[PDB]
Design a protein around this ligand. Sequence first.
Ligand SMILES: Nc1ncnc2c1ncn2[C@@H]1O[C@H](COP(=O)(O)OP(=O)(O)O)[C@@H](O)[C@H]1O
Ligand SMILES: Nc1ncnc2c1ncn2[C@@H]1O[C@H](COP(=O)(O)OP(=O)(O)O)[C@@H](O)[C@H]1O
Ligand SMILES: Nc1ncnc2c1ncn2[C@@H]1O[C@H](COP(=O)(O)OP(=O)(O)O)[C@@H](O)[C@H]1O
Lengths: 525, 525, 526
Amino acid sequence: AAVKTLNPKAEVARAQAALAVNISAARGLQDVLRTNLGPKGTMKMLVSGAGDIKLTKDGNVLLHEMQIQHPTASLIAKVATAQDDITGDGTTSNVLIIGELLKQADLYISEGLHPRIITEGFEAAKEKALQFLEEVKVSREMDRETLIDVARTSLRTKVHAELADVLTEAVVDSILAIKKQDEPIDLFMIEIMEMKHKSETDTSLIRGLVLDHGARHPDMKKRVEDAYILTCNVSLEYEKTEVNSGFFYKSAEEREKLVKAERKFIEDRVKKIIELKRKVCGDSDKGFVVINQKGIDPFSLDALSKEGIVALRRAKRRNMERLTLACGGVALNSFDDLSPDCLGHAGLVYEYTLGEEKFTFIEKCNNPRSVTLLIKGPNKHTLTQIKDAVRDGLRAVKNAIDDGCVVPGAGAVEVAMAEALIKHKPSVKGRAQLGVQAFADALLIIPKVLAQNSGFDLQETLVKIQAEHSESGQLVGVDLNTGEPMVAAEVGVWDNYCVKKQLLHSCTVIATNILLVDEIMRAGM
Amino acid sequence: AAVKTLNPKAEVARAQAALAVNISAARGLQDVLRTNLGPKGTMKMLVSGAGDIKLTKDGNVLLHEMQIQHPTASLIAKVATAQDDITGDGTTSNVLIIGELLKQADLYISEGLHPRIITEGFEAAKEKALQFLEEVKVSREMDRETLIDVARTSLRTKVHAELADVLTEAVVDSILAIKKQDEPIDLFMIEIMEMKHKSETDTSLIRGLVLDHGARHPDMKKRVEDAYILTCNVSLEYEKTEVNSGFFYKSAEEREKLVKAERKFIEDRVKKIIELKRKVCGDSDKGFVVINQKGIDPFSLDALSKEGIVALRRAKRRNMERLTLACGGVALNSFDDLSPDCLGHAGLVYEYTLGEEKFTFIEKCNNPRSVTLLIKGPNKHTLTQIKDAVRDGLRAVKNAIDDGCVVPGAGAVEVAMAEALIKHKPSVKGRAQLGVQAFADALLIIPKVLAQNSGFDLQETLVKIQAEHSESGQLVGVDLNTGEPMVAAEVGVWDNYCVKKQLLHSCTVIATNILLVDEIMRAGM
Amino acid sequence: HRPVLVLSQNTKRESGRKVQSGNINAAKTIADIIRTCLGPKSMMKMLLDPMGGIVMTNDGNAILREIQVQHPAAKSMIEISRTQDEEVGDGTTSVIILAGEMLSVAEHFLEQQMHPTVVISAYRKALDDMISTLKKISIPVDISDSDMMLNIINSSITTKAISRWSSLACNIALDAVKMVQFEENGRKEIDIKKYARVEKIPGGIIEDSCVLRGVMINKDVTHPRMRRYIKNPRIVLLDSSLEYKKGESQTDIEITREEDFTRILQMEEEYIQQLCEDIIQLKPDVVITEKGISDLAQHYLMRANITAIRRVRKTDNNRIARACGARIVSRPEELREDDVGTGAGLLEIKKIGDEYFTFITDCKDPKACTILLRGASKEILSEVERNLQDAMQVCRNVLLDPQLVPGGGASEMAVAHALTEKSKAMTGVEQWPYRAVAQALEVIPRTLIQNCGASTIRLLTSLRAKHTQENCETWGVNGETGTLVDMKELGIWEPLAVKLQTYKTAVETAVLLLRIDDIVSGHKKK
Ligand SMILES: Nc1ncnc2c1ncn2[C@@H]1O[C@H](COP(=O)(O)OP(=O)(O)O)[C@@H](O)[C@H]1O
Ligand SMILES: Nc1ncnc2c1ncn2[C@@H]1O[C@H](COP(=O)(O)OP(=O)(O)O)[C@@H](O)[C@H]1O
Ligand SMILES: Nc1ncnc2c1ncn2[C@@H]1O[C@H](COP(=O)(O)OP(=O)(O)O)[C@@H](O)[C@H]1O
C-alpha cells in the first residue's frame, strides 16, 4: 500500500476491501434495529458506565447510546440524528433502508458490475419514487379526529398501547390550543415536566403551566384562587454597584443608617409591587403571584409575605414566554411603568410537594396558547419512555398540520412504491436497469420487518400483500394482528408526508456516497 | 450463553451468529482462489517461514500453504485434500461451488426462511444434476488423440502454454505404455525426477528408468551398452551375526586368518555374481549392471570393478518394482538360484554428473511398461510447477482411460446443468422451490470466474452463453480469447467424468452440513 | 562512565543517489494516493482524523491535509496542494499528479550521469513555452452572459460530488460571486471568504438549498415581547455594549452619606437610558450589537418596539454591514442617519429543527450573501461546502481573467505537440530532458481513461494523431463515455488562471526537489 510507505502506523483499505467494511457494518446496525420497528417490536435496556437504566427502542436513542466504534456506524448515526431533530419519527426506518440499499447492491457489484452504475439507477428510481409519493398522499383538511389516528400510530410504536390511548388525548389536544389562523406552531410553548406522583398511566394535560420550583417562604399561601400573575425580570435581591465603592462610617449609630440606606433601593422595588396590589381594588381575596426569573433575597420575601403576595424565584428563560401567553400579561424588565394592564389572570394557583421538591401549578386560563404535559412516571427509566414518546408524538402532529396531506400507513406506501418502479424499470434504457431493482427491493424491507417482528412469515406475507395490490387499486398494507393484507387508509393507520419524503432523500444520497468509497484509512498521527 | 457459565474461557457462536462465521469465511476463500481458475489465472508466490518460494496456483497447494487459522477454512481444506488425492484436478472448482452454495443460500435464510428448507432443495437438485451428467458424457473409445486434448486442458491451467505443448507429449505417451487389456494403470510405475540441466521446456520422456545415484567406484565404466540388469536385494556389505559373538585369537598370525575368514561369506555372494558374467558368453563387451538396493562395502566394489561390473547401491523400494518390469528380470533376494532367466537387458546404461551428483540412466528396452518423466527445470521453485502439473495431468488421463466416457469442457457442462434445473424447478411441489434456484445459480460460477479472469464482462457473457444454449442443442461454453460462446466438444476442451461427478457430491454434502451448524464453540480447557 | 568524543550527536547523514532517487519515490507515492480522484468518474475517499470526525471527500486538497507524513520531500508535496487551493479553486489534484510525473521522467536522466542543474535548466525553458502556448489556444469570454458562465462552473463541478445537482449548484455559485462583487474606490475586489458565508443546517433536502439575498445568523431575539416579523426594518449595527461595566481606571467611591449609595444605583440606570435615548432618535427597528445587552436596555427597546439581537459575532457584523448597507458604530451618542441600514427586506425569526435562526433577506442591493445549505447530515454538507468553495473561486478567476482553456486532456496534448516541434531546433544536451516534459504532460489524459476503464494504448495513439494537424487541436478525453469527443461540443472548459497555476507549480516543485542531494535530520531548535 502507498499509505503504509509514508506513514507506517496508518491502516488502509483498498477498493474491494473498503466496500466490505461499509456493507458488513451496515448489516450490523440493520440486524439490531430491525427487532424494534413498529408496535410489535422489542424493548431495549441501555445501561451506561454509571449504571442508569435507559429503557427505550427509538432508533435515535439506540444509535447514540450504543458501544460501537466504527466509521460506517458513525455516518448512519449522523443521518439518524437529523431525522429525529426536524420531524421526530422515521429514525428506525431510516437505518433499515440504508442497510438494504447496500445489501441489495452487494449482489450486483460483486457480480462484475461497477458501483457507479448502481448509483445511476438509484437516482432514476428516486425521481419516480418522489413523484409517486405526491400521488398517494391524502388530504383530510386537518380534522381533529384525523390527528388522533396520526398520533396513535407514532405512540403505539413506543409504548404498550395502554398509555397510547392516554397520551393521544394529551398530544392532540395540546397541539390544537397553541396557534390558529394558519400560523406555524412553536413546540417551545409546551413544557415537559417529570413527576413521580401516581403511576405511568396518569399523564394529564395541564392547560396552564407547571413550574418545578415553589415558594421559598413558609408564611406564603399554598393555594391561591383568582390570582394576578406579575411576570418580572428585575433583581429583587441585594446587588452591589458595578464600581467597587465600600461604605465609610464614623460612629456605630451611623453604621445602621448605611444598612438602612443600602436596602432603600431594594425596598423601592418592593413598594412598587405592594402598591400594585392596592390599586386593583384589594377589598377581596385578590391573590398575587410573582414568578420572578431573578432571585429574591429573604428580606424582600418576608416583606411580601406580610402583604399576602406569593413570590417565586430562579425561573427559566422560556418561562417568560410561556407564562406571558398563558396569563396574558407583559413580561417587564423594570418597574418604571407599572400598571394593571401588565397583570395576568388564573383561576387557581396551588403548590404540591413531592419529597422536599415543590411544584407550582397555574391552571384555569381562558385562552392559554401554552400548555404542559404532566408526566407522572414512577421510575426514572419510565420517565424517559414517555418523554421520548411525547416529543415523538408532538412532532408527528406538527407535521400533519403544517403539511396539508397525510401519507398512508405501514405497508400502503412502500409496497405500492416498489411496484411502481418495476413498470418504469425498462424506461431507463441503459446499464442502470439493475439499479432500479436494487432500490425497489430495498423499499420492501418495511413490510418484511413488520411481518417478522409480529411473528409471521417474511416471504409468505409479501406474496399476499403484493397480490392484493396488483389485483386492485387500493393501497393495501400489513396487519400486525392477523397477517392478512389490510388497507391502512381505512383501519386508521397513517404516517407523515415529510417523513417518507426525507426517507427517500436522506437514504439515497448516503447510499450513493458510501458505495463510491474505496480508500478508508486512518492518518494524522 | 450456557457454555459461558460452565467454562468462562470458552467462546461460542449462536444460531444467527455461527451462520455468519461460516459464510463470510467461505467468501474469503472464494475471493482468493478465484484468481487462478483456468488458463488465464495468475500465479501465486507462496513464501514459508524459511524463505523458500513455492510458486504455484493449484487449489490444493494454495489452501494448505496459507497462513489462516479458521474452523470453516479447515473444513474446505479437507474436502480439497481428497480432490487432489484420488482424481487430481478439480480442486479450484471445488471451493468455488462451496463459496456459492453458502452465498446464494444466505439470500433466503436471512429473508425469513429456515436453513433446513434450503438443504432439502439441494438433494432434489443433486438428483437431477446427477442424471443430467450421464446424458452429456461422450464415449470416444479412449483414442490416443482424444487423450491429448484431455491432457492439454489440465496442463494449460498450470503453465503458460509453451510447456503445455511439451508436457502433453510426456504425459500421454507415458500413460499408454504401462498397462493394456483393461488393466488398472498403476501410477507408481512412473518416476518423477527433478534435474537442473537445460531449461523448463526440455522435459523429455525416458522410456526406461532414471536413477538418482551413480557408481560408487572410480574404476567402473560410465557408459555401458548392451547391459544385463541384475536386480538384487542382498546386502553385500559386511554384516555380523545376530548373536553377539566377537573373535578370539592367540597369535598375530591367527589374526590375519580371521580377517580373511570373516569376509568369506561376503565374497561367496560376490563369487556368485562374477560367475554369472562368465556364463552369459562373455567373449564380447557384455556389460553388467547391478542396482543392489542394499549397501555394498568397498571391498566388494573393488572386486566387481576388476571384472568389469557396474554396481550401484542404496536403491529405492519401488526401484525393485519399476526396473523389474522394465528389464524383464526377477528381483532376487538370494544368490542360491542364480540363472540367466532372472537377468534383464538394456541397450544403453550411462551416467551423468550434475554438480557432484550422478544420475544413472537406463534406456532402450523392448516393452518396458515403466517410464520416467525427466523434469529439468532451471530453478528450484520451477521444479514444483512442473511436478504439480505432471501429477495433475497424469491423474487426468488415468481417469479418462478407466472411465469409458469423456465430459465436455469449460461452460459446456455447468451452463447446461443450470438450465436443466430451471425447467425442473416446479417439479418439487413444496417449500424447496428456492433450493433448486440456489443450486442452479451456484453452478454458474464456473462460466462467471472464467469470464472474469480473462478480462471480459461477467453478466454480459452469461447472457450470450445461455442464449446459444436455449436456442440450440449444442453444449456451448466459454471462450477465453474472444468472449463469444463456443462449443467445447469441437475446439478440443474436455474434462473428466469423475471430477464433475464428485463436484456435485462432495460440495453438496459439505454445504448441507455447514448450513445446519449453529453452535460453533471452543471448549476443552 | 566516560562519554564517547563524537561530533553532531544524534543526527543522520544521507547523500548521493539515495536522496536524489529517494525524493522521487516519495513524490510518486503521493501521486498514487490521489490518482483515482481526478476525472469525473472519481470516487470518494473516507478519512479519519484524530479529533474524532470523518472526512469523506474526493477533492485532492482535503485528502492531503489529513495525511501526516514523516518524509521531508513528502511534506513539500502537501504544501503544493495547499498553494493551489488558496490561489484557485479547482487547481490542486492535477498538480500533484503532474509534479509526480515530471519527477518520474527526471529520475531517468539522473541515471544517465546528467547533472540536476541541466534538467532544471531544461525545465525552465519548457515552463516558459507552456505559458505562451496556453495564451494562443485560449478564447475570450463574455462575462456579461449568464448562460456562458454556467457552462464554466459546470465543468468544475462535474468532477465533484455536486454533479448530480448541476442545475442548482451552478445557479448558487454564480449568484454568490456576483453579489459580493464590491467596488468602493477604483479597485475591483471579490471576497468570497469573509462575505460569502456558507451556513449548513442538518435536515431537509439538498434541492431546497438556495442562496439567500442577505445574511442569516443562529441567534434568537433577546426578549419575547419583541417582534419576530418586520417587513421593512431600519437596522442599526452597534459594536459597544449597552450595559454598565467597570471603566479602565482605578475608580473607587467613598460613600459617607446615606443618599450617596442610592444615587449611584440610579446613575447606573440613567446611563443606560441616556444611550437608549440616543439610538431611538433615528427611529430604528432592529438593534444588533456584538456585546451584552442588560435588562434595563431591553426595557427601553420593548416599549419603543425594537427587536434586539444580543451576541452576534464580529465576522457576522461585517457581513450584514455590506448586505443592509449599514455602518458598524461603537458609540450610541455618535449615531448618524447614514449609519442606519435601510433597504433591508423581510426580517423573520424562523425555526429550523428546534433552533431559531434570524433571517435578514430580500435586500435591494446586497454586497454580501449567505448560502443556506440543507442536507442529510453534517457529513455530506461539509462535502457540498467544500465543493461550493471550489465552485465560487473558479467563477472569481473568470471575472478577473476572462480566458478559457480546453480542458479534459485537450489542454495537455496541445502543448505536448508544441514542445515536441519546438525541441527540433535545440541541438544540444538539453534536448532530451526537454522532450520528457511533453511526455510528462500526457499523464492527465492518461488518468481520465484509467478511472473510467477505457483502453490506454488504443486511445493515446488516436489522440496524439489528432494533434498532428493544426486545424482542430482541441480534442480531449470524454471522461463520461470513454471515447474522443471534441471539447467544442461537450462544453468542458477550464479557466486560464487554473491552467497557468497548474503548470507553474508542477515545474517549480520539480525544481526544488531535484536540487536536494543531502538531508540532515536530528537537530533541535529554539
Ligand atoms: N398500528 C400500526 N399498524 C401497522 N403498522 C404500524 C402501526 N404503527 C406503526 N406502524 C409502522 O411502524 C413503522 C415504524 O414506526 P415508528 O417506530 O414510530 O417510526 P421509526 O421506526 O421510524 O422510529 C412505520 O413505518 C409504520 O408503518
Ligand atoms: N483451454 C481452455 N479453454 C476453456 N476453459 C478451460 C481451458 N482449460 C481449462 N479450462 C477450464 O478451467 C477450469 C479449471 O481448470 P483447472 O484449474 O485445471 O482445475 P481446477 O480449477 O479444479 O484446479 C475447468 O473447469 C475448465 O473448464
Ligand atoms: N466531462 C469531462 N470530460 C473530460 N474531462 C473532464 C470532465 N470533467 C472534468 N474533467 C477533467 O477532470 C479534471 C479534474 O481536475 P481537479 O482535480 O478538479 O483539479 P483541482 O484539483 O485543481 O480542482 C480536470 O482537469 C478536467 O480536465
